[PDB]
Design a protein around this ligand. Structure first.
Ligand SMILES: CSc1ccc(Br)cc1CC(=O)N1C[C@H](C(N)=O)CC[C@H]1C
Ligand SMILES: [Zn+2]
Length: 139
């Protein structure tokens, strides 16, 4: 679990969005596993606007942060799950690191701010949904 709170927006994994997220929907994209909902309170986070390929993510299944080198946002095949059919997930960045399904929502940050959230994984792999291209989050 986990979310980004920026301005009057809440960014979550689309497959973990609540009834309240859907009732206050701003934007969602199944191909990215993202959903953004509106909030009444002002957020605590800021978004990176950069091309960093290194950063640190929070791994809830280890209660620890880990440093990672990750690929640029790309279209990557993701196997079927209870949440989605087998498809290409877009704007996804992969890295070597530990992850389990419940780790989705953990934030990846670089020196500039929030880069994205955990969305996929594998055997010693962790994949992050990028949010740096969503310029409207800042206004
Ligand atoms: C951190 S998730 C994870 C971690 C390790 C392993 Br093995 C396997 C996973 C599962 C995984 O990749 N997905 C991706 C899915 C999606 N984004 O299409 C939504 C959550 C889940 C079902
Ligand atoms: Zn950066």
């Amino acid at each position: 679990s986990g979310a980004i709170y920026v301005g009057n927006y809440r960014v979550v994994n689309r497959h973990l969005a609540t009834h309240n997220d859907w009732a206050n929907l701003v934007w969602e994209d199944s191909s990215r596993d993202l959903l953004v909902s509106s909030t009444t309170a002002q957020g605590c986070d800021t978004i990176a606007r950069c091309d960093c390929q290194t950063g640190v993510y929070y791994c809830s299944s280890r209660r620890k942060h880990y440093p990672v080198s990750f690929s640029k946002p790309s279209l990557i095949f993701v196997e079927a799950s209870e949440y989605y059919p087998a498809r290409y997930q877009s704007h996804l960045m992969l890295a070597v690191g530990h992850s389990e399904p419940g780790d989705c929502g953990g934030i990846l940050r670089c020196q500039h701010g929030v880069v994205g959230i955990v969305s996929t994984g594998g055997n010693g792999l962790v994949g992050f949904a990028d949010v740096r291209d969503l310029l409207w989050l800042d206004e």
